[PDB]
Amino acid sequence: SHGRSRFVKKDGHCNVQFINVGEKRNETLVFSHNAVIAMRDGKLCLMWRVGNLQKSHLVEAHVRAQLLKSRITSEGEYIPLDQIDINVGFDSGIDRIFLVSPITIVHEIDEDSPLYDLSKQDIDNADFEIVVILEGMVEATAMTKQCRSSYLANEILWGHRYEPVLFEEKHYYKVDYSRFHKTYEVPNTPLCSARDLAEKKYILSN
Amino acid sequence: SHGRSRFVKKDGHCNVQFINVGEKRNETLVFSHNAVIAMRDGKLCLMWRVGNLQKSHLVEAHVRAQLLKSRITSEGEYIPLDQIDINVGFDSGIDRIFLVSPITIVHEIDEDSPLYDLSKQDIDNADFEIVVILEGMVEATAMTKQCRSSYLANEILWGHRYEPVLFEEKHYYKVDYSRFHKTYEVPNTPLCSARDLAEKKYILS
Amino acid sequence: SHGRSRFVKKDGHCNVQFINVGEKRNETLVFSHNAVIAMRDGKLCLMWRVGNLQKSHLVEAHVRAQLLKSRITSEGEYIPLDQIDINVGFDSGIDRIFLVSPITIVHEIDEDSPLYDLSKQDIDNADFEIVVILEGMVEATAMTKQCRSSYLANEILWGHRYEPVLFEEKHYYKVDYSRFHKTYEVPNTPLCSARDLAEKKYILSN
Amino acid sequence: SHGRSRFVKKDGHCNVQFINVGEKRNETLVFSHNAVIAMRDGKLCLMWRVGNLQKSHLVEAHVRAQLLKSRITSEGEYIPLDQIDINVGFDSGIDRIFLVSPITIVHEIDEDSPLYDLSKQDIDNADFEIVVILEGMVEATAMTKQCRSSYLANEILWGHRYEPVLFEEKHYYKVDYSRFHKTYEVPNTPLCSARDLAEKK
Ligand SMILES: [K+]
C-alpha cells in the first residue's frame, strides 16, 4: 500500500511533478471551489481541499475554519459577527499539516460540531458561511501567508467526495490539478443529521 | 443568521469597507479606550475590543492579557510586579483570532479569574492595571506586530456593552470606526461579584 | 496592588526608565549570574532572572529550561547528553512572558521536577547543569533571538531571593540594573529537599 | 553524570567544536541516513538522529514525523495519501528541541503508534514510508526553515542504536560528524512487535 517510488527523497525534495497547473499565479495556495459532506470511517464529516500550486515549503502550516453568523445572547445583546471555530484538530496537533500534494481537510461532525443537527434538507435551506484558512510561512520567499476562502451552505455538496489528484508513475508521483475542484456523487450517503446517525447507531448496538 | 452578502469572497478578499477611520496616524492596530464588564450568556465577563485599521491583514493573530499588581508572598517577599495571566482562551486555542472587522475579546470571570471576588464597588475602589496585547505577523512579509494597551480599574465600565461597528450593506459590509470606542449602558447588570452570582445560583438550586 | 503611574500607556508606550545599564553591549537580553532556590507561597522553587535591554519589545517571548546530564538506559545504552525539560509553565501558556521590567522565572520543585529529591547538601555536592533559554522576536526587525545561559549546581544559591530592580517614581517606573544580579539571603529557608517538605506537611496534617 | 566542562557558557556560547563535517555533499545534511528500532527503558522505540544546520542554526526548533501510505475507507473511498502523524512529544512540548549537538528523536511505539503491531519480519515485508521533519527559525534573523527526509521501511534498522557523536575533551565537547550515520547492532533486541512485548508483562 505504498507506490513503487518514495514520496520524499533523502535530500528532502519531494518526488512529485505537478501537471495542469495553468497560468503561473502570484498566489499559489488554493482551496477547492466546493466543500463536501460525506461518510468517512463511520463518521459524517465536512471536508474541503487545499493545495500549493508550486513546490515551495510552507513552514509551520496549519488550518482553521470558522462558522460566521450573527447571534443574540440571552441578555438581548446583538452580536453582528460571532466567529465560531470549528474543530480541525487543534487540541491534538493534527490541524498542523505537511503540504506537498493537495490535502483534504476533515471536520468530524460530532456532538460538539455546530453542524451536528443538520440534515441535507437543513443545509439546502440554510444561509450560513464557513470561512477556511491556511496559514504558515513560505521558506524561500520569507512570506507569511494566510490563504482564505469561504463556503456558503449552498456551496457544500452533501454526498460528494473529491476526485483523486495524486497518481503513481514508475519513478515519481504526479498531481493532476485538472482534478483539483472535481467531485463525484456518492448516492449511498445518508441524508439525515450526524445526531440521527448517532441515534440509529446506538439502537442497533443493542 | 447571515447578511445577504458573503463576508469572505472565494478568492479570500474580505467583503468589508472601513469608514470614519480619520487621519493617517489612525491606520494601525488599536484597542478600545475602555474595557467593560457585563453578562453574556449567563456569565459575567470582562471584555475589550481590538481592531486593525491598516490596509495590511494581521496573520496568525492571538491575544493575551495580564493583571499587574504588587504582591507580598506568605514568606514576606515583596514582588514589585506580579503579571498574572487573564484567560482569554489559550487552552482551547480561541485566543487565536481571525481579525477582519473589530473583535470583542472575552474573559469569563470564572473561579480561576483574578476578578472572581470583585463587585462593582470593589472595582470602584481598586487601582490595578490590566495590560492587553495583540500579536501577529504582517501578511506577505516576515515582519511581526505587537499592539499593547492597558485598562486601569477606573477605565473598566461596569454594566456596559460596545456599540456595534459592523453593518450590512446590500453587496458588502461596512465597519463604522466612529462607533469603535462607544458603549451603551445595561442598568440590568448585577452589581455583585461573579462569586456571589455563583452563590445566588445555589440559593436557586 | 499599584503605583501612582500606569505601567503601560494607552498608546502602548511602557512608562519605564532604565538606569545603570552597564552600557553598549552585544546581547541585550541578559540572565542573572546566579539562580536561587527559595520558598515562594509554601513551595520550594528554583528561580532565575531574565532582562531585556533592547531598544524594542520582545514579541511572542517564551522561556524554557533543561537539565543536562549523561545517562545509561536499563538496556545498557550510553546517552552522552540527555536534555530533560524543566517545567516553567508550557502546559498552561505561562512560559509566555511580556518582558518589560526584569522577570523572575519560577520552576516549582514538585514531584515531577528533576530536583524534587535534592537538599541543599545534595546540590552542594552535585555536578549537573541547567540551561535556560529565552526566545522571541525583536519587535523592530522580527529577528528571532535565542538568549541562552547556564547554571551549574554550584551557581545555584540555596536560600536566596533577588533584590527588587523596579521602583516607583511620581510619573514613571525606574528599573535599576545595578540590582539585576544581586541577591539577599533568607536564613529561614528549609535546608531539606522538596520531597522532605511534602512528607513533613503530610505528617503534620495526619 | 556531567563532563568536566560546562556545555553552555554563561554568555550563551555553546562549548562544542564540530569536526569531520567534510566537504559533505550537503552542508544541508540534517537527518541520519537510517532510522532504528530498539529498546529504550523497557519500551520499543523508533528513533532517528537530527543535527542542526551548519550554516543556518535553527532556534524555536521542533520536530514531526508522519507515516505515508494509501488506504481505503470502510465506505470504499480510495485515499491515495494518508499522512498519519507519529507522536514525538507534541502534547507535552518535548517535540521542541534545543538543538546544539545531534539529537536522537524518539517515537515510543505504544498502543497508539501505527507501528504497535509490527514485528521485525512485518517491517521486512512492508513498503511504507516515514517522513521526518525539522522546522525552526534561523537564529538572529526573521527567516524560517523546514528540513525534510524520509525512511522507507527497509531503511529502518531493527535492533540498531546510533554511535555516540558527542565526546568530552578537557575544556570543551567535540561532535565527531564522522559517526553521525553510524550504528551498532544490539543482538539482544526482541524480534516481536511492541504489542506482543506488552502482552507479556
Ligand atoms: K494542550
3-state secondary structure chain C: CCCCCCCECCCCCECEEEECCCCCCCCCEEECCCEEEEEECCEEEEEEEEEECCCCCEEEEEEEEEEEEEEECCCCCEEEEEEEEECCCHHHCCCEECCCCCEEEEEECCCCCCCCCCCHHHHHCCCCEEEEEEEEEECCCCCEEEEEEEEEHHHEEECEEECCCEEECCCCEEEEHHHCCCEEECCCCCCCCHHHHHHHHHHHHC
| Distance between Cα C95 and ligand 1 center (Å) | 13
> CB-based contacts of C206: which residues, under 8 Å, 6+ apart?
none
Q: Return the residue of C nearest to B71 by Cα.
A: C1
> CB-based contacts of B177: which residues, under 8 Å, 6+ apart?
B18, B19, B20, B21, B22, B26, B51, B53, B165
Which residue is it, cell 501505527? Answer: D114
The whole-angstrom separation of Cα B35 and Cα B154 is: 10
Q: Which residues of B touch C59 (CB under 8 A)?
A: 135, 144-146
Amino acid at A192: C
Beta strands in chain A (DSSP E): 16-19, 29-31, 35-40, 43-52, 58-72, 78-86, 96-97, 103-108, 129-138, 143-152, 156-158, 160-162, 166-168, 173-176, 183-185
> CB-based contacts of A188: which residues, under 8 Å, 6+ apart?
D75
| Distance between Cα B88 and ligand 1 center (Å) | 15
CA nearest neighbour of D193 among D44, D39, D41: D44
Residue D12 to residues A42, A51, C30, C48, D16, Cα–Cα distance (Å): 53, 41, 10, 15, 12
User: Which residues, listed in sequence order, are joined to residue C47 by a DSSP beta bridge?
Assistant: C36, C106
Q: Which residues of D70-97 are buried (b: 16+ CB within 10 A; e: fewer)?
A: beebeeebebbbebebbbbbbeeebbbb
The pairing of strands B29-31 and B35-40 is unpaired
Query: C187 and chain B: CB distance < 8 Å anywhere?
Result: no
The resolution in angstroms reads 2.0
Query: B143 and chain D: CB distance < 8 Å anywhere?
Result: yes
Contact indicator for D43, D115 with CB cutoff of 8 Å: no
CA angle B69, B73, B77 (to 5 degrees): 95
Query: D90 and chain B: CB distance < 8 Å anywhere?
Result: no
* Domain extent listing, chain D: 1-201
CA nearest neighbour of D50 among D181, D174, D152: D181
Please judge whether B98 and A127 are an interchain contact, meaning their C-beta atoms are less than 8 angstroms apart.
Answer: no
Contact indicator for A144, A133 with CB cutoff of 8 Å: no
Q: Which residues of B touch C186 (CB under 8 A)?
A: 75
For residue B191 the three cell numbers come to 452589581
Chain breaks after residues in chain C, where C lies over 2.5 Å from next N: none
Query: B139 and chain A: CB distance < 8 Å anywhere?
Result: yes
Contact indicator for C143, D142 with CB cutoff of 8 Å: yes
Please judge whether D85 and A93 are an interchain contact, meaning their C-beta atoms are less than 8 angstroms apart.
Answer: yes
| Distance between Cα B21 and ligand 1 center (Å) | 39
Coarse DSSP helix, strand, coil percentages of chain A, rounded to the nearest 5 percent: 15, 45, 40
Separation of CA A27 from chain center: 19
The domain made up of A1-206 is a member of CATH 2.60.40.1400: yes
> CB-based contacts of A73: which residues, under 8 Å, 6+ apart?
A79, B40, B41
> CB-based contacts of C200: which residues, under 8 Å, 6+ apart?
none
Amino acid at A99: L
Experimental method: X-ray
Please judge whether C80 and D10 are an interchain contact, meaning their C-beta atoms are less than 8 angstroms apart.
Answer: no
Give CA torsion, residues C94, C31, D6, D11, to 10 deg: 130
CA nearest neighbour of B77 among D82, C160, A204: C160
The whole-angstrom separation of Cα D10 and Cα C12 is: 33
The whole-angstrom separation of Cα B59 and Cα B140 is: 9
The whole-angstrom separation of Cα A136 and Cα C200 is: 51
CA angle B10, A131, A65 (to 5 degrees): 140
Amino acid at C58: L
CA angle C115, C119, C120 (to 5 degrees): 115
The whole-angstrom separation of Cα A50 and Cα A180 is: 9
Coarse DSSP helix, strand, coil percentages of chain D, rounded to the nearest 5 percent: 10, 45, 50
Phi then psi for residue C180, to 5 deg, are -45, -50
CA nearest neighbour of A164 among C80, B121, D142, D82: D82
CA nearest neighbour of D152 among A9, A173, A102: A9
Residues 29-88, chain B, touching A (beta carbon < 8 A): 38-42, 57, 59-60
Neighbours of C109 (CB within 10 A): 23
Task: Tell me the three state secondary structure of residue A120.
Answer: helix
| Distance between Cα D92 and ligand 1 center (Å) | 7
User: Which residues, listed in sequence order, are joined to residue A104 by a DSSP beta bridge?
Assistant: A49
Q: Which residues of B136-170 are buried (b: 16+ CB within 10 A; e: fewer)?
A: bbbbbbbbbbbbbbbbbbebbbbbbbbebbbeeee
Domain topology for B1-205 = Immunoglobulin-like (2.60.40)
* Chain D adjacent subunits, 3+ CB pairs under 8 A: A, B, C
Q: Return the residue of C nearest to B30 by Cα.
A: C11
Query: D142 and chain B: CB distance < 8 Å anywhere?
Result: yes
Query: C131 and chain D: CB distance < 8 Å anywhere?
Result: yes
Query: D148 and chain C: CB distance < 8 Å anywhere?
Result: no
May I ask the CATH architecture of the domain D1-201? Sandwich (2.60)
